[PDB]
Every structure is written in structure tokens, then in C-alpha cells.
Design a protein around this nucleic acid. Structure first.
Ligand code: TTP
Ligand code: CA
Ligand code: CA
Ligand code: CA
Ligand code: CA
Ligand code: CA
Ligand code: CA
Ligand code: CA
Length: 325
DNA sequence: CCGACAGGCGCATCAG
DNA sequence: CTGATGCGCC
DNA sequence: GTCGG
């Protein structure tokens, strides 16, 4: 499918090992940055030396590319693939609510399969129970057609609670993707700003629960909701898969920093925020602030557009669709 | 010789 | 109960 | 694991 697919799959596979098994989050980030920059690279890689010229590709990854180009495989990945404890820790992380730490603890106590998870539901917290319950469904992708139906429902139900709410579907959907992993809703309301909860998120969640769109809750606070949703199914047909849904209530005046973050992609955001540091700024979902001599953020800069944030760090403006891999 | 590596919400655990 | 720290996730 | 350096 892809030009350097073998290379990027390998580096992605190695990344997952370092994150899930070794618990080295920055090694995982290094492999991702290496995979990302190679993916965009428009030439077919003929050697490890050619790859090392790209930023984020060093001596060790170059050698691994040489081994991959020569033999068509990696001995390190063979060793990891065949190791049972590694595979079990790597598998359990795919369940929503289980990360590297918990997965390891489960494997130590003889829990290595879905069978073992379902038989030992008592050992799992609420977040994890739901992730286990809809395991197969959360693995599936959401067609854009279904994302449009989900958008129609959420916007209509949000309007019915209050006409001054504005909901925006971000994520890969806003980047014009054919499919998505889940729905990401960015919410605002005039009553909530950075200068001044009133149950603003609750009322929207409650109304979406009331009409049976939202089926479960993984976690829920005043600004951030995290849970499960499902489209209405017709008569005599199989039900739609249960889908992950995130709703985030960001202050109305800080919408553009918010929508920038939640539009993505993830590696794009990491690069932008990393580039902001080198330019002497710091970016979060709320603001863009200048860094002091000791790395202390100053007062928020005036942001009106998404482009404004790009301008401060001398970046050519990329439309949502140009922020993918 | 290290350090930094994006940044923060919700939830959980520990020491006091 | 705080405050510090860590987990899982976005 | 890479860059900074
Ligand atoms: C997971 C993750 C998300 N994000 C941001 C970018 C994402 O667009 C946003 C939440 O979107 P996600 O639903 O996490 O991912 P996505 O929508 O980009 O891709 P998919 O279609 O597979 O769901 O938050 C990060 O900056 N870093 C991360 O590690
Ligand atoms: Ca590509
Ligand atoms: Ca390089
Ligand atoms: Ca998980
Ligand atoms: Ca998404
Ligand atoms: Ca999401
Ligand atoms: Ca049902
Ligand atoms: Ca402007």
C-alpha cells in the first residue's frame, strides 16, 4: 500500500514494544517520529545511510533499516514476536483502560487472554470493564457516512439543550478522512470563558444519554467527557458497533487553540508543539504563550484564527486535510 | 556527563 | 482531608 | 532513540 511501508510498519511495531513492554515513552516517540518522517519522504529508501539524513533518524534506526533492506525482516522483532510474555503485555494494552503498567501486572498474575479478562472481571475497574465489553467494536473503524449521522444527532441534540452551544466534530473527520477511530466533539458556550460549573457539559451529556445516543461513561469531569455512543439501528438489521466518543468543553474565547489540538493528527501536534519550544513558545489546548529565560510561560498571545498560531512559529498554514500522515 | 523529549483532564494511590 | 506522583488517555 | 552539542 505505502512506499516505505515495510520500514514504517517495522518502526511502528518497535515503537509499540517500547511503549507497552519496556515502558520507555520517549523511545516510543523516537520510533514514531522516525516512522512519520519516513512516511512523508517521497523517495524509495535504498539504504540506512539515506534514511539517517532525515531528521529523527539516527545510527541505530539506520542499522535496523539496513538489516530490513538486506534480509526483509528484523531479528529483534522476531524475538519479540515469539516471546509470549511480551505478546500478552502488548495485547492487553489494546483494551481501553489498560496501559503498560496494568497489562504487566495482569500478566504477572497469569492473566494473558480475553478469556482470562472475562473470567476475572472482578479485578478490573469501570473504565476497563467497558473496554473489555466493547473490545471488538472499538477495534473497528467508523465510515464517514456513519460519522455524518453521528454529527447530525449530536448537533441537533445540543441545539435542543441550548441554541448558543456550538459543537464541532474534530479528529480525523475534520481532516476529511474516509474513516475514523472515534468521534471527537469540541464544545463551547458563551457562559464559559477563560475569565468566568454551570453544568454546561453535564446537560449535553444527559440529553445525549436521554435519547440513548450515549450508552456508557468511561470518565466524566466538568470540562472533559469520555465514553461510548451508538447510532440508532433499524428493524431486522444487526446493530451498529458501539463507538468511542470524547466531548471537550473549551472556553469560547480560546476556541482556536482548542480546535487546533483536537483536529490533529497526534504526531502533527507533537511536531508543532516541539517546534513551538524551539521558537520560544509553548502551546496547549487553551493558549500559546512565550517562554521565559527559565522556561516559564508568560501571558497568552492574541489568537483569533488557527493560522495565527502557525504564524507565531513561522509555519506555512496547513489545512486540516494536510495535517495527516 | 546528563537532559529534554507536548501538555493537561480525570481518576487513583500513597504519605501524612 | 491535601499535596505529590503516576496511569491511561486525548 | 535522537538531537543538542
Ligand atoms: C491520541 C493523541 C491525540 N492527540 C490529538 C490529535 C487528535 O486529532 C485528537 C484526538 O483524536 P484521536 O481520536 O485520539 O485520534 P484521531 O482522530 O487523530 O485519529 P483516529 O481517526 O484514529 O481517531 O487529539 C494528540 O495530540 N496526541 C495523542 O497522542
Ligand atoms: Ca503517506
Ligand atoms: Ca538525522
Ligand atoms: Ca489501552
Ligand atoms: Ca478520532
Ligand atoms: Ca478520541
Ligand atoms: Ca443494544
Ligand atoms: Ca489574524
Amino acid at each position: 500500500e505505502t512506499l516505505n511501508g515495510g520500514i514504517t510498519d517495522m518502526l511502528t511495531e518497535l515503537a509499540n514494544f517500547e511503549k507497552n513492554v519496556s515502558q520507555a515513552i520517549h523511545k516510543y516517540n523516537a520510533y514514531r517520529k522516525a516512522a512519520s518522517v519516513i512516511a512523508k519522504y517521497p523517495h524509495k529508501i535504498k539504504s540506512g545511510a539515506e534514511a539517517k539524513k532525515l531528521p529523527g533518524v539516527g545510527t541505530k534506526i539506520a542499522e535496523k533499516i539496513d538489516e530490513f533492506l538486506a534480509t526483509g525482516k528484523l531479528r529483534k522483532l522476531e524475538k519479540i514476536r515469539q516471546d509470549d510474555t511480551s505478546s500478552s503485555i502488548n495485547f492487553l494494552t489494546r483494551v481501553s483502560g489498560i496501559g503498560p503498567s496494568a497489562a504487566r501486572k495482569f500478566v504477572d498474575e497469569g492473566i494473558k487472554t480475553l478469556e482470562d479478562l472475562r473470567k476475572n472481571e472482578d479485578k478490573l475497574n469501570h473504565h476497563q470493564r467497558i473496554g473489555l465489553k466493547y473490545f471488538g467494536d472499538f477495534e473497528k473503524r467508523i465510515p464517514r457516512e456513519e460519522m455524518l449521522q453521528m454529527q447530525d444527532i449530536v448537533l441537533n441534540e445540543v441545539k435542543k439543550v441550548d441554541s448558543e452551544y456550538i459543537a464541532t466534530v474534530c479528529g480525523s473527520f475534520r481532516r476529511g478522512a474516509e474513516s475514523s477511530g472515534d468521534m471527537d466533539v469540541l464544545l463551547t458556550h458563551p457562559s464559559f470563558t477563560s475569565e468566568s460549573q454551570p453544568k454546561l457539559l453535564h446537560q449535553v451529556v444527559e440529553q445525549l444519554q436521554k435519547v440513548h445516543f450515549i450508552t456508557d461513561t468511561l470518565s466524566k469531569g466538568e470540562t472533559k467527557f469520555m465514553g461510548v455512543c451508538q447510532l440508532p439501528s433499524k428493524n431486522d438489521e444487526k446493530e451498529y458497533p458501539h463507538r468511542r466518543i470524547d466531548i471537550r468543553l473549551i472556553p469560547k474565547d480560546q476556541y482556536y487553540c482548542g480546535v487546533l489540538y483536537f483536529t490533529g493528527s497526534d504526531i502533527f501536534n507533537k511536531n508543532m508543539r516541539a517546534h513551538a519550544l524551539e521558537k520560544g513558545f509553548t502551546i496547549n489546548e487553551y493558549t500559546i504563550r512565550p517562554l521565559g529565560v527559565t522556561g516559564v510561560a508568560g501571558e497568552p498571545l492574541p489568537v483569533d484564527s488557527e493560522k495565527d498560531i502557525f504564524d507565531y512559529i513561522q509555519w506555512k498554514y496547513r489545512e486540516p486535510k494536510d495535517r495527516s500522515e
